[PDB]
Design a binder for this molecule. Sequence first.
Ligand SMILES: [Mg+2]
Ligand SMILES: [Mg+2]
Ligand SMILES: [Mg+2]
Ligand code: NA
Ligand code: NA
Ligand code: NA
Ligand code: NA
Ligand code: NA
Ligand code: NA
Lengths: 173, 173, 173, 173, 173, 173
Amino acid sequence: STSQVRQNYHQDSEAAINRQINLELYASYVYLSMSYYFDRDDVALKNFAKYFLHQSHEEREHAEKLMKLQNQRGGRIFLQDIQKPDCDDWESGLNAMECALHLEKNVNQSLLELHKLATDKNDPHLCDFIETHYLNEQVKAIKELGDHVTNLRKMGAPESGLAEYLFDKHTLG
Amino acid sequence: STSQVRQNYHQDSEAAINRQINLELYASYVYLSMSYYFDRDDVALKNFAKYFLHQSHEEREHAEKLMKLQNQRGGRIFLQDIQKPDCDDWESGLNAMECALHLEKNVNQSLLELHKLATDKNDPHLCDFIETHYLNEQVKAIKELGDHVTNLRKMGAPESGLAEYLFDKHTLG
Amino acid sequence: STSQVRQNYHQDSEAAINRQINLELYASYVYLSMSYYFDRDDVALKNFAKYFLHQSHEEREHAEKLMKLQNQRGGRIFLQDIQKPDCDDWESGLNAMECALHLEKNVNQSLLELHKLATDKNDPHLCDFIETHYLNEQVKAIKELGDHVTNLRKMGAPESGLAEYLFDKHTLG
Amino acid sequence: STSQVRQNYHQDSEAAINRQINLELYASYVYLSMSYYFDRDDVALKNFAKYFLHQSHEEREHAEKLMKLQNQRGGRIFLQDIQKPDCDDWESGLNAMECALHLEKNVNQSLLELHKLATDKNDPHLCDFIETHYLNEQVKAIKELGDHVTNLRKMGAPESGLAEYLFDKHTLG
Amino acid sequence: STSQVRQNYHQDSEAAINRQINLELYASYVYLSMSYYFDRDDVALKNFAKYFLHQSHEEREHAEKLMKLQNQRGGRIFLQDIQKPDCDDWESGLNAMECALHLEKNVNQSLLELHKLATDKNDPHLCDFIETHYLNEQVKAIKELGDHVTNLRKMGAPESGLAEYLFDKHTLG
Amino acid sequence: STSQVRQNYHQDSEAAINRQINLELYASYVYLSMSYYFDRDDVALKNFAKYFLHQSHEEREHAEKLMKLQNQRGGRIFLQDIQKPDCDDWESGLNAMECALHLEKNVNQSLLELHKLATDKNDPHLCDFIETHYLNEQVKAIKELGDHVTNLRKMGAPESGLAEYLFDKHTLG
Ligand SMILES: [Mg+2]
Ligand SMILES: [Mg+2]
Ligand SMILES: [Mg+2]
Ligand code: NA
Ligand code: NA
Ligand code: NA
Ligand code: NA
Ligand code: NA
Ligand code: NA
């Protein structure tokens, strides 16, 4: 049953990786929802739509990298349902950015728990994988989203449709 | 409530489009599963993995095109859970190709029902969308998968691991 | 009297095509009016003017393509007066965009009736002509105009002359 | 009510410019009719069709230049119906060329009356606009059409279908 | 017996496709005959010969595309004899063009019946195949041949050997 | 009745050339059948299909060259029906190659009879035409097909579907 390649790879780490794969696919799907919300004719913020679609594809890439890791270490991928996002209507550019920030912080929390598990199981390869490919990406994503939220709020979003319009043009465009 | 852009777009068509979006995302996820099955160290068919990953990304593109359609017509996207694939272990290149063929024919059947609905609702734009972007794609995909299955079977898959090896190299590589 | 090329081309289809030619020329003339309204010294929205002039020329192209169709099928073009547009003064960028949206939806409705007639007369060539060259063009145009209207309204048009100014610059420029 | 830019621009000149705009659009529409007459399967003179389509587009350009003038001077464009051309069937290349010559001379006569009005109102800018952009264009167009008519008649048009064929090929092609 | 790829493909459609393949090969052979008629030393119209040879090859391409369709849908090609053309001696450029026009209209009629059958069997893929690849091609070909016939007749074909000579040079060359 | 160009061209040679034209068109049609047999989803040997399609087009070229010869010598082409091939289902790559070899040898036998006739009628131009353009082409084609048959048989065709697969890839691809 044990993979010929498997070495120093705990069952708990394998399970946590599978959970992280599901979470990344969930995040991708959330961003997809947000993108096409901004593509609606009654919202019509093209650069918001582009930004979130880019994020969706990036999240899928993260999931695929975790799957590659799983196979590299001799674990076995077990996929689960990808839950639909919490919202269909994201209300505003600002609200979407705040929800994205919340999502990214939740993903980061999951990654930090995964790193703690890897450290507890004395799996330095997994710890290094998480540090190298995920933790700084999360810190940067959170910083960027926080900057966006700050700018939108200062500009007067979401009540100032001019605010969101000009943010869409000048920051995201 | 009605979109300012909506014209000649039946509620049943909007609902059927949402169902098709979900089906396309499901197909993408199935192909993702197959790809990373072939990336396993105990299967190790790199070109199978590449082929199915390509299909996964293509299916995501199809879903995104349907979402774009939905917004173009003034319908509203409602996402649902993406169910996990039926298998975690796809057993063989031949078995994966047969399951892919079955999947593509099911997607094609859903598209045909969508076309019939569009026709019944006298929605020529939707009909020609389906025709132009999907139906021929499906016919081609089904033909390609059938060709693959025929070749694998004739070569002696799945019992001939040499068969699958050489198919991976010469057809998919 | 019958053209040597004519085949499967109903008199009702020929008449409907002539009506569509007139409607397209009318739309071209409406857009011409809007363009030069925005070129007025007391309006001075250069990119609105450019946008509507482009639309005017596009509508002329659509009319010419219908005339080419008419001759291809062996029907005979009968031109009628091109009525002057409903307005001389279009009041605002937002009002012009709303009137354009209304115009495009009326043209689309006429095209849909044309398609239904073609279908009823079992004229698949005409049906596919309409589908290929017109229906998607209309859907796209309606979506774009709806997006413009949404943005203008959210920005505060037509009372915010700053709104229209910045829309002219950043979207249409 | 008076435009901030308006200076030395008589109401009669503004009205005459509006009349000239309508006449130019009428001429464009006449040429459009002639072009697609020659595109008929039972006439089939491609280079006649091309020549008259070019003239149609040129006439629209002339109308647009007059509209630009109108706005530059602070007059207000008032569009009227564009009357359908006098003929649907132009009978022959020679007959179309003769009608075109007649049309161009009528347009030239209207321009001359416009110039006389400008002169009487001591509007040197308008006079020089007409002189610079229109009068020489008309003289050239009339000379070209007269040359065409002379050649066709000498060749034996309209009774010599060979005549029209070879003229189409060698002069207009 | 049923192809693994076959889906929504009626036996009547398969049979009609086989009939269309035969008709296209017949048309190719007719054009071949016409081409080499014009290559005769006592006819010597090189550009007629070239035109009809081009048409012959185009018709073969159409047949091959129908065969590809047949295999794509999982039908089975059944070839039949290709009947010899009705004439060995085509008498004149004009007569050949008229026979070509008649042939193209017959092929178009067969395609229209095929489309009607596809529609009746609710085969939107087949319908759109026919619409996309064939119907417009036929309309264009019929229009071109009608234009040629009109020109030849007006020039004085077939009694004016000068007529046919100059048509060969200037239109077909 | 006699062509102005005809010189030293026997009626028997003209008739034999017409027979050879028909035989070449027959061979082209046989190869077309074989090609699309290999394009079937249940055979799926793309390079076999390509090889035989190439042969089909080559055979058509041979027929056209014979027609050109016929006109060059002042004979008159008389076309006959092109009989359908003996098979619809060619069973295997090996069987198709063997049938192709048989076909090529039959064509060669016909060409040798034609050369004997030309020699008997003291027609050195025709003898040279046959020698230069046909006899070596036939010898090469027969040698190539024999080589293919030898390789397939040695590899284990037609029972080894791996054999045919790898031949398709490495020789014909
Ligand atoms: Mg269609
Ligand atoms: Mg000449
Ligand atoms: Mg090998
Ligand atoms: Na991520
Ligand atoms: Na798909
Ligand atoms: Na239009
Ligand atoms: Na003019
Ligand atoms: Na054809
Ligand atoms: Na040959």
